[PDB]
Amino acid sequence: LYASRAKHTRFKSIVQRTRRLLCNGASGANGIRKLSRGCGIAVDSGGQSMEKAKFVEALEESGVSLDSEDIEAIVHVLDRSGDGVLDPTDFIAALRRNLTPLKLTWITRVWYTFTQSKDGSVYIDEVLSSYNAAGHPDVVQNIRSEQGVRSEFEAAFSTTTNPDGAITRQEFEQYCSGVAALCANDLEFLTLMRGVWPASVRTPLDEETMRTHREQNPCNMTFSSYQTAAEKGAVTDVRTTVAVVDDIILSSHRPVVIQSPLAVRQLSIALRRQDVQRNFFLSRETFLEVLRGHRLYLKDPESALTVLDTAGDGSVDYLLYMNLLLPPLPPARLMMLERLWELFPKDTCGTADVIELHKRFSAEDGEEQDAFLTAWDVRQALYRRFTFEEIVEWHTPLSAMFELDNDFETMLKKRWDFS
Amino acid sequence: ETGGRMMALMEQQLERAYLSNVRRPLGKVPAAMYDVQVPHSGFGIPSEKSES
């Protein structure tokens, strides 16, 4: 019965290779969008059905060649009905979320800086005006010029590409996944995103603290043949701190929270309540006091919190902490949850009301109704509004109880309505 | 010839479904067919108390 797991590993390798090949071609950051346009996708999260031969010829014209065994693996993973038909949005989702947690954190952070419409879309005028090409690291080091990068970005988003004039979340994530595959590592992506999208960071800081934080990043600390003893020791200290924080989080904090949706939801509420700027940052003492109230502890707060500081000012990024704490979901289940999310009206900052959740739920036993009402209390919600990440975190522990995606389909249809 | 470790692990995985391996293991009590809970003080009735 190891053929299935061989197929799954092959699917992961296929996703890796497809992401590298598309972004290295003629259209670098626009490869995934071009693939989606070629496949014939017209709805962002629709359930349009597409037959296998058209999918393989679409990938062939995109620039990726697959023989029989990779086609079989893709069909096995994606076709959940056995009818010989599949939905390419699952493959595009698999290409979309293949990132390290820091990249996903900052990609999510940039998206909420915009002004969202009645139906979750964002206008093209705002995203065109909010781009700042002067801060591109390519321009600052003086390899290319501002006009060139401005022209290429304007060609990326134009009236012929999007006749309606509104960009969805999925399209922006596809573009950011494209532009992420060209950067070398996490630090390059952070520098590019900070320089290009300036509204992401709310307060500036001097170049001295920024350069000291940049020099101490794990990417720059790396061995060499002609090193001296002190700088070897510095590299050792940085690497040991990163390893200890990662393994203590994974070994200790995850088993406490992953056993029930109630714990995840309550921890998310506790973290989000203390945020006043709504930029996913907290002070150190506030973070330690929040974690103390939920039976999670650290052996050395000064060394442990130096890796959750992705802003360089001494704050704590709890979005990255929650991303590292919980495991990512498979793309099919994420598509299911986004199809559920489509049925909610949204305000200017991208939230929906909790009453909408309440009138769309249908439990079976008393215990699950009690847990749902306790977690999704109207009084405990921030401002009677909830976001999509809260839904993802609530559904993550339930998704770990099933191995096949058809079971998750059936449970979603039973619990929820329409989707 | 032995086909390494993965084949051996799967071979032992296919073995325990035998009834003999279930009801007759080596140096062990055969496993229970339902869950049991061991009380804090152990099994048996606690001794009844009386007034001083």
């Binding site: - | 010839e1 032995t2 080596l26 140096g27």
Partner: protein, 430 residues
């Protein structure tokens, strides 16, 4: 607790080469002599058979003797041959001529002192010496004469140690040499006085094992010598690995021999089964016990069903329960009670060792002391009596110098051995 091996003549040297292959494999010794094993359990008793030379290498505590160097040059030239110490190869310049008297009296006394010098050099270096182990054939020329000569010298020099022999003996069904009965009779006369324990194997039984049990299409002498090397390496297993019920060569001797002349044993090894069949039957202690007592699995032509067991021993290798072992040995003793000597209350000793041979989950070697061995010696004595009445080839032996009185003495001693075995088979408790 270290053993010193001696290999004599063509048969002995050939079996020895396979034995040292099997032992080097079990302890993970490369044919260059470098340790390449994969568990500490291999290293921790390596001293038992190997001495350590400087660096990586280990050298095997063995003396190689032959009268013409052809075999010795073949063993030195073999794939594992390099491991052997060069100074340990002793050879002459002319053959035994298939003559016992030549091998014992003329060239034997010429070489024998250098062999004792090497054996003494090896023995006195040991911190505590266990018994000697010797492989030779009784039907040959150099095998019989120098093996029994050397056995006598080592028995003079180390009377408090153990004396163990493995010996191949002529069958009437497929003889390779005409004068086999004389050499066999004189050698059995020497062994019954000198030895502490002697193991006997028939080539006919190894052919029947190969053809019927293993269904080999074209077995070769390498296979027969591999089966023998398997049993030889199995008897010593408790010396060199941990276990739940340890055993020792001296403990085997004390439990098996009731009276000092009754020291001749049968051999078997149980998990023999063809590659096609292995998918159809799992190993277990009842299955091993059933093969273990099946005469199909015994390495002599005499069958247990015509005699009775005085004593037997079984050494088990592997992880198994002692209850199942004890009750299996009891059930076999109770169900077949007429084949067990009644004035001994329990005839079988068991022993259990944790570490099986590589690629087997479990294995057992069986040693049996049964009166049916008398038929084999009787057959050899018949052929001797047919040949001796007519002086058929005697002038060769007399020309070397033997008195005819030796032949009548050797016949009388072998006939007395047969009589001693036959009387205990046919007896009552009274």
């Amino acid at each position: 607790r270290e053993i010193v091996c001696v290999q004599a003549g063509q048969c002995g040297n050939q079996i020895g080469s396979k034995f040292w292959e099997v032992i080097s494999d079990e302890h993970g010794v490369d044919p260059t002599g470098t340790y390449q094993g994969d568990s500490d359990l291999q290293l921790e008793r390596i001293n038992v058979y190997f001495d350590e030379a400087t660096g990586g290498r280990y050298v095997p505590r063995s003396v190689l003797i032959d009268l013409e160097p052809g075999t010795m040059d073949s063993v030195r030239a073999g794939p594992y041959g390099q491991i052997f110490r060069p100074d340990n190869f002793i050879f002459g310049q002319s053959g035994a001529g298939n003559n016992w008297a030549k091998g014992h009296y003329t060239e034997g006394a010429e070489l024998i002192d250098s062999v004792l010098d090497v054996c003494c050099k090896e023995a006195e270096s040991c911190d505590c010496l266990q018994g000697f182990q010797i492989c030779h054939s009784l039907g040959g020329g150099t095998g019989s004469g120098m093996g029994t000569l050397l056995i006598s010298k080592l028995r003079e020099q180390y009377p408090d140690r153990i004396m163990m022999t493995f010996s191949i003996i002529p069958s009437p069904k497929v003889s390779d040499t005409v004068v086999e009965p004389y050499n066999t009779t004189l050698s059995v006369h020497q062994l019954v006085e000198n030895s502490d324990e002697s193991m006997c194997i028939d080539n006919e039984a190894l052919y029947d094992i190969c053809f019927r049990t293993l269904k080999l299409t074209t077995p070769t002498f390498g296979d027969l010598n591999h089966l023998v090397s398997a049993v030889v390496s199995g008897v010593t297993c408790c010396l060199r690995f941990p276990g739940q019920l340890n055993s020792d060569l001296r403990k085997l001797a004390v439990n098996l021999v009731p009276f000092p002349r009754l020291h001749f044993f049968m051999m078997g090894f149980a998990p023999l089964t063809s590659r096609g069949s292995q998918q159809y039957r799992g190993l277990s202690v009842p299955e091993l016990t059933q093969q273990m007592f099946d005469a199909k699995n015994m390495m002599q032509a005499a069958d247990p069903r015509h005699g009775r067991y005085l004593t037997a021993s079984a050494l088990f290798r592997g992880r198994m329960s002692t209850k199942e072992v004890d009750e299996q040995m009891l059930n076999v003793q109770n169900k077949n009670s007429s084949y067990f000597i009644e004035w001994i209350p329990n005839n079988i000793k068991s022993s259990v060792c944790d570490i099986p041979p590589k690629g087997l989950k479990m294995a057992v070697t069986f040693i049996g002391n049964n009166t049916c061995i008398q038929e084999m010696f009787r057959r050899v004595g018949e052929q001797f009596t047919l040949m001796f009445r007519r002086k058929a080839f005697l002038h060769w032996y007399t020309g070397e110098g033997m008195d005819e009185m030796e032949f009548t003495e050797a016949e009388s001693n072998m006939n007395d051995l047969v009589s001693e075995y036959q009387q205990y088979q046919d007896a009552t408790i009274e």
